[PDB]
Design an enzyme around this catalytic site. Structure first.
Site, mmCIF file in Angstrom:
data_model
loop_
_atom_site.group_PDB
_atom_site.id
_atom_site.type_symbol
_atom_site.label_atom_id
_atom_site.label_comp_id
_atom_site.label_asym_id
_atom_site.label_seq_id
_atom_site.Cartn_x
_atom_site.Cartn_y
_atom_site.Cartn_z
ATOM 1 N N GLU A 11 0.780 -1.202 0.000
ATOM 2 C CA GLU A 11 0.000 0.000 0.000
ATOM 3 C C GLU A 11 0.824 1.269 0.000
ATOM 4 O O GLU A 11 0.316 2.328 -0.358
ATOM 5 C CB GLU A 11 -0.952 0.024 1.244
ATOM 6 C CG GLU A 11 -1.873 -1.211 1.342
ATOM 7 C CD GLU A 11 -3.078 -1.115 0.431
ATOM 8 O OE1 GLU A 11 -3.166 0.066 -0.144
ATOM 9 O OE2 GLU A 11 -3.845 -2.041 0.184
ATOM 10 N N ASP A 20 -6.595 6.412 -4.845
ATOM 11 C CA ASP A 20 -6.108 5.029 -4.968
ATOM 12 C C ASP A 20 -6.163 4.550 -6.417
ATOM 13 O O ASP A 20 -6.485 5.334 -7.315
ATOM 14 C CB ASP A 20 -6.748 4.077 -3.948
ATOM 15 C CG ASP A 20 -8.151 3.619 -4.250
ATOM 16 O OD1 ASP A 20 -8.687 4.074 -5.321
ATOM 17 O OD2 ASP A 20 -8.720 2.832 -3.575
ATOM 18 N N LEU A 32 -8.960 3.906 3.051
ATOM 19 C CA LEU A 32 -9.989 4.507 2.236
ATOM 20 C C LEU A 32 -10.821 5.590 2.987
ATOM 21 O O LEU A 32 -11.308 5.440 4.126
ATOM 22 C CB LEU A 32 -10.882 3.431 1.666
ATOM 23 C CG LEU A 32 -12.045 4.057 0.886
ATOM 24 C CD1 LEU A 32 -11.551 4.589 -0.457
ATOM 25 C CD2 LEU A 32 -13.103 3.005 0.634
ATOM 26 N N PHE A 104 -8.238 -6.584 3.655
ATOM 27 C CA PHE A 104 -7.872 -5.192 3.817
ATOM 28 C C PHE A 104 -8.093 -4.380 2.512
ATOM 29 O O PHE A 104 -8.517 -3.241 2.484
ATOM 30 C CB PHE A 104 -6.374 -5.157 4.216
ATOM 31 C CG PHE A 104 -5.873 -3.750 4.546
ATOM 32 C CD1 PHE A 104 -5.479 -2.874 3.534
ATOM 33 C CD2 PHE A 104 -5.713 -3.338 5.868
ATOM 34 C CE1 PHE A 104 -4.988 -1.600 3.837
ATOM 35 C CE2 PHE A 104 -5.218 -2.080 6.199
ATOM 36 C CZ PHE A 104 -4.880 -1.200 5.167
ATOM 37 N N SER A 117 -12.486 -20.378 -4.787
ATOM 38 C CA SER A 117 -11.090 -20.284 -4.381
ATOM 39 C C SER A 117 -10.980 -20.602 -2.886
ATOM 40 O O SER A 117 -10.002 -21.168 -2.435
ATOM 41 C CB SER A 117 -10.561 -18.868 -4.535
ATOM 42 O OG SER A 117 -10.642 -18.443 -5.857
ATOM 43 N N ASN A 132 -7.320 -20.288 -9.947
ATOM 44 C CA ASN A 132 -8.665 -19.739 -9.875
ATOM 45 C C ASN A 132 -8.650 -18.299 -9.347
ATOM 46 O O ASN A 132 -9.389 -17.434 -9.772
ATOM 47 C CB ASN A 132 -9.529 -20.666 -8.971
ATOM 48 C CG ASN A 132 -10.956 -20.191 -8.772
ATOM 49 O OD1 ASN A 132 -11.283 -19.436 -7.850
ATOM 50 N ND2 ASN A 132 -11.819 -20.591 -9.658
#
Ligand SMILES: [Cl-]
Ligand SMILES: [Cl-]
EC number: 3.2.1.17
Length: 162
Positions: A11, A20, A32, A104, A117, A132
């Site tokens: 990040e 972002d 965010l 996250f 998955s 996948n």
């Protein structure tokens, strides 16, 4: 290596409001602020998050404080989620970090959405889960970060980050 150093690499750190990869208003370590287009809807969310009038800029400490909260909330969300919890419980410590990373970035709802998955991870079919996971908007939009996360699920080591 741990979850904190892993997300800090994925990040980055920015002390000023930025947009972002999806175009949303963010600050610090991937925190965010709002999906709204107005920088005016973003500034107030920021002040409310910090407890002060910031004028769009924060310190390193403040960033790290938002980060500790966000990691704590990701873990707690996984544990309260009926689809995620059983996957998390089944995993080793490294792979648990990979799931937390996904949560996250995309939120619990999004992750809980990767039905197939998740089932493959729970069964410990690593190579098939990696194939996948790649068939997703997530992988096409943020390929380099997705490949690191995927590699962590496939191998169970921190190699992609070393
Ligand atoms: Cl907050
Ligand atoms: Cl990327």
């Amino acid at each position: 290596m741990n979850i904190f150093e892993m997300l800090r690499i994925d990040e980055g750190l920015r002390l000023k409001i930025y947009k972002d990869t999806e175009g949303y208003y963010t600050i610090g370590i991937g925190h965010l602020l709002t999906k709204s287009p107005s920088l005016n809807a973003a500034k107030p969310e920021l002040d409310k998050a910090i407890g002060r009038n910031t004028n769009g800029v924060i310190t390193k400490d403040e960033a790290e404080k938002l980060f500790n909260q966000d990691v704590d909330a990701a873990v707690r969300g996984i544990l309260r989620n009926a689809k995620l919890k059983p996957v998390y419980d089944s995993l080793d410590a490294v792979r648990r970090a990979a799931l937390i990373n996904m949560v996250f970035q995309m939120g619990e709802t999004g992750v809980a959405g990767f039905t197939n998955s998740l089932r493959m991870l729970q069964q410990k079919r690593w190579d098939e889960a990696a194939v996948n996971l790649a068939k997703s908007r997530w992988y096409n939009q943020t390929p380099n970060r997705a490949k690191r996360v995927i590699t962590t699920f496939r191998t169970g080591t921190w190699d992609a980050y070393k």
